[PDB]
Design an enzyme around this catalytic site. Structure first.
Site, mmCIF file in Angstrom:
data_model
loop_
_atom_site.group_PDB
_atom_site.id
_atom_site.type_symbol
_atom_site.label_atom_id
_atom_site.label_comp_id
_atom_site.label_asym_id
_atom_site.label_seq_id
_atom_site.Cartn_x
_atom_site.Cartn_y
_atom_site.Cartn_z
ATOM 1 N N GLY D 11 1.827 -0.587 6.762
ATOM 2 C CA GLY D 11 0.956 0.534 7.079
ATOM 3 C C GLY D 11 0.090 0.207 8.297
ATOM 4 O O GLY D 11 -0.503 -0.889 8.374
ATOM 5 N N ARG D 72 9.645 0.390 8.457
ATOM 6 C CA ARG D 72 10.239 -0.487 7.451
ATOM 7 C C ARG D 72 11.637 -0.954 7.862
ATOM 8 O O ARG D 72 12.482 -0.145 8.270
ATOM 9 C CB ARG D 72 10.285 0.218 6.096
ATOM 10 N N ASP D 103 1.053 -7.642 4.184
ATOM 11 C CA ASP D 103 1.500 -8.888 3.575
ATOM 12 C C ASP D 103 2.995 -8.847 3.316
ATOM 13 O O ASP D 103 3.625 -9.892 3.113
ATOM 14 C CB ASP D 103 0.719 -9.192 2.294
ATOM 15 N N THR D 125 -4.498 -4.187 7.825
ATOM 16 C CA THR D 125 -4.382 -3.209 6.725
ATOM 17 C C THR D 125 -5.781 -2.712 6.374
ATOM 18 O O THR D 125 -6.748 -3.490 6.440
ATOM 19 C CB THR D 125 -3.686 -3.802 5.420
ATOM 20 N N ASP D 127 -6.570 -1.904 3.442
ATOM 21 C CA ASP D 127 -6.710 -2.215 2.009
ATOM 22 C C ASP D 127 -7.533 -3.470 1.727
ATOM 23 O O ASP D 127 -7.965 -3.682 0.583
ATOM 24 C CB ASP D 127 -5.329 -2.335 1.313
ATOM 25 N N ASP D 129 -6.621 -6.385 1.376
ATOM 26 C CA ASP D 129 -5.926 -7.095 0.282
ATOM 27 C C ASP D 129 -4.993 -8.234 0.712
ATOM 28 O O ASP D 129 -4.049 -8.584 -0.002
ATOM 29 C CB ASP D 129 -5.137 -6.110 -0.599
ATOM 30 N N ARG D 171 -4.217 0.953 -2.302
ATOM 31 C CA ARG D 171 -2.982 0.438 -2.868
ATOM 32 C C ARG D 171 -3.263 -0.165 -4.235
ATOM 33 O O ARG D 171 -3.553 0.556 -5.188
ATOM 34 C CB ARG D 171 -2.375 -0.627 -1.941
ATOM 35 N N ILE D 250 -6.253 10.309 6.004
ATOM 36 C CA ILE D 250 -7.334 10.192 6.972
ATOM 37 C C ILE D 250 -7.878 8.774 6.941
ATOM 38 O O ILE D 250 -8.357 8.290 7.950
ATOM 39 C CB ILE D 250 -8.498 11.135 6.665
#
Lengths: 319, 319, 319, 319
Positions: D11, D72, D103, D125, D127, D129, D171, D250
């Site tokens: 992403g 991807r 990751d 990212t 996230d 994470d 996520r 967004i």
């Protein structure tokens, strides 16, 4: 007409990219080639001119500034520079021009029309001071830039119980100051189009801190004078912690508001329409919420108005 | 401890409301009353002091400024003013204070601790110049205010192929300038903590327009000098269209970033924790991404650093 | 008239606070008392009503939402609820109302006018769907909220070469979708007022990725249907990575644009003007860039239009 | 090393352009050529690869998304696809890669390292994470996007006295929800890392409207479940006007915060440093406010934590 040119001159304004994009897409819709002329009129002389393709305007609608750049061209006003200009046009067989920008620029476009190159003018300036239109591309965006700054100054002015003088751009027009003052609830607003009295202003300001207004915001169009001047003349007759801020060139940049994008899109396409129609020496705009166009020379005479009924209101809502 | 006070002094910063909110909610969580002391230390003298209830902090987390206001109190530094202050505290039986703001303010709080009124200091300033913390409440928000302005100036600088000098606040610290310069890709950055050479700067700037950089942005911390100075000294040795903008007090206002809200919330609650713990004369902060607290006097000695490894990088990425 | 009331009902919109502020300041300018009625019409029944002073409206012009709150009152439509309402009004001697909000709300105000309580209606809704006005307070701010979200989605759609369906509010009107689609350069726009063909839309979309558009944005007014529906019916006939986002209630909140502040200030004051004039059962607005007012009943019949010339343009600029 | 490649996969996140810009400028600073590999790993197969010059990264630091695009590539995981990849690299003599993104992407880079192509991984990212870093590029910008939306929803929730469920991305990680909940003063926060009880949540919520909280905001990480689910299960046990909003994509777009620009600039340059140093199979990051790098395999095992001390605080400040 099968081939036109487009350029931006005068001070850049947000929404100029959206106009360019609109001129390009609208022309290509109609099987007309479009050439990007770079650096304002200074590109008609250097011949820095390039075909613009669809992919050329495919990532600009939301971008501040002008991707064609802009520059002052005194050279072009001369008969020599002018004909170097015309020669470059003929050379690429460009038949007409959409000119996007200030009122300086509307002159270059009437000149070209008289010399066989029909031109349509499109109002691009944050100052909102181009006749033939209630609104110019970049005004609305400017306003939002201003009120955003004012909102931030109000936080500190309030916390510290200080009074602030804020200078806004506008050149010779009070529209930025007037609309932004209103919108930010300014204690007073100074604009070229309406008389102010500095004593009446101190007065309104003592009779505010009497009743316990700890802070005030005063808006000054740069067309009336310097905020660093008004701020000191105020510190003297109140002996009261005054601060000045000169907003400056931020007012010119930034991704354009929804209002400006729509306006630029509507006017840019409109301009192409008239070019492809056999009209030349016209400018377009929005009046009474209606799309209009005007003989340029008829209306370079007409002098700029703010709405006075809107100035009154600002007085009535500040007391 | 059953009753504490809280106040904000020095220059206001965005996120001060979120800290106040945190001090209030955290104390009330623990059955401790909280009193809002208004106008900085000047409220300890006027006795403008009010109980703060839950509903008092119920609509402020996102608001710039301080709802307790702030003001300079030389009076309070005097033995007289100081004891008027202490007397008002005893009068309401306030046992301890959380002081939110600059490093001027950490002095008032150690003073009170020595006189039986334990105080904890909380770093509130956009300047990021308070020892004991990597970050002060309002810095991050300031940075965003700056880069937002720079982004807007880049649009006009680019369109017109001009070079700009932008003055940022910071008082005596280059952190705003350093972080904002980096973040905006400034051609050069002038900060008190690192040497600059004005000729090396013109040089980098000619060797940019050689290779066809038409525009540049130079960032100047107000702690090195005036942008209107640097701008002219630049216009002279390049004869090249230069513009200056002095961002000013906008850097102080505005709704705080997510970073500042979280920081203020974490530090405000932390401060209450130590007060309710029998610790006094401490300040809190974040170091190496860990919440810490420090004997105030031990660390008012320690002198401020920017990260030099970050200044190097700004040189390497501007060339 | 010496005493009036003001309330907000229907969906709240940014700029409602600026309107309230304007109604209050304008009336106090004329020596008329103003009473804030809370929770829309539900306040005429509970009697949650309070005199509004100058300082009441002193820090709201820039604030989203309504400080008077708003609520649905079926009770009030009943003869019983209605007369509990009237009785509270007489009790406080309130002689007239300014009603700020939706078109549901204009009914309450004509009702009161027929029962000796002159009311003036003021258009507050992001939907831009109130007859008698080209524009409603909160529309412009909604547009900016939308385009801001679109701009962010374009970033990710572009990076990943995905196609996005974005659902916008607007209730039964396509104005938000139409203006925001235009302003964001959407590949296509679905609105209640104009026919769309889903196959024509897939077509425009295949003939975009043919020529190498990797990403597209499609805009859907909630008044035509569900984005999660259109997105799937699209994934099927293209087998092509589709994403849906439903913007939701963010479109309702936030500090109002300069456009909405000015509009709300102008219309608020205007409303008071007519009340104080012996006019009742009227609503105000802006038509052809001119402030106008209308007999409410005459124009609750008239049906809403988008500008079709603006929809065409969106087709022409998307190809 | 004289020639390296750089790509973005997973992403996209705001600040990826600033990282790319930093990798390019830092390498060119050291006389090393850089090649932009487009469409993530899918570019190592299609061979869509281009030398990146200085002017390539000259107008992107402030831009959301990734100008190298991302995609991807299952193909690349296959031995076949992998070696088509390697062959394109040798073909252009690219000796090493900086990989910017998720990751998922760190696996491609350790794979290449074992096959003689040293790779350094860079955490991109929203996230937050990615192990080996307290913070990932785009997190901070995501937070600001969220709180901005929350602030707007609070306006309408407050005006209407409604309760709102807001679903945020993340996520499998609760960091966005946790930090944004805290920062927005949410009544409660649901995150994968910490237990919640729905009944305890209704309870806190009844005991809020008892004491006269008219409105509440509840924050739900998408990694715990659906907001449309929680909202209904809430409407049932309170019979109380509930609204759900799913923020959506967004959160992924938009011009990066100052925090993310700086982070991306620092980590990008850092990555190049290690590549040019004979280090491979490493990822960089920021831990305890210090720049660090780690053997990738050593730390793909290590499992993600939010700070629990920060979750407690959110409980304590909501009551």
């Amino acid at each position: 007409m099968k081939r036109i040119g487009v350029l931006t001159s005068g001070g850049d304004s947000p929404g100029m990219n959206a106009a360019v994009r609109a001129v390009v897409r609208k022309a290509i819709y109609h099987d007309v080639e479009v050439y990007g002329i770079y650096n304002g009129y200074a590109g008609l002389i250097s011949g820095k001119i390039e075909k613009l393709e669809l992919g050329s305007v495919g990532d600009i609608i939301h971008r501040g500034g002008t991707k064609l750049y802009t520059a002052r061209c005194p050279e072009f006003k001369t008969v020599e520079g002018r004909e170097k200009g015309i020669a470059n046009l003929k050379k690429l067989g460009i038949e007409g021009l959409v000119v996007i920008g200030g009122d300086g620029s509307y002159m270059g476009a009437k000149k070209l029309t008289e010399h066989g190159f029909p031109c349509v003018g499109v109002p691009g300036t944050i100052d909102n001071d181009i006749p033939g239109t209630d609104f110019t591309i970049g005004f609305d965006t400017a306003l939002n830039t201003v009120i955003d700054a004012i909102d931030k100054i109000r936080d500190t002015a309030t916390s510290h119980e200080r009074t602030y003088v804020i200078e806004v751009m506008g050149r010779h027009a009070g529209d930025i100051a007037l609309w932004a003052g209103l919108a930010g609830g300014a204690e007073s607003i100074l604009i070229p189009e309406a008389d102010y009295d500095m004593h009446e202003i101190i007065a309104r300001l003592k009779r505010g801190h009497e009743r316990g207004k700890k802070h005030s915001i005063i808006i000054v169009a740069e067309g009336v004078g310097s905020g660093v001047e008004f701020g000191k003349r105020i510190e003297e007759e109140t002996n009261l912690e005054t601060r000045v801020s000169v907003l400056g060139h931020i007012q010119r940049g930034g991704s354009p508001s929804a209002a400006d994008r729509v306006l630029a899109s509507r006017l840019g396409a409109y301009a192409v329409e008239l070019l492809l129609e056999g009209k030349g020496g016209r400018c377009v705009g929005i009046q009474n919420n209606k799309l209009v166009d005007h003989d340029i020379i008829e209306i370079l005479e007409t002098k700029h108005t703010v709405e006075q009924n809107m100035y009154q209101l600002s007085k009535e809502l500040s007391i």
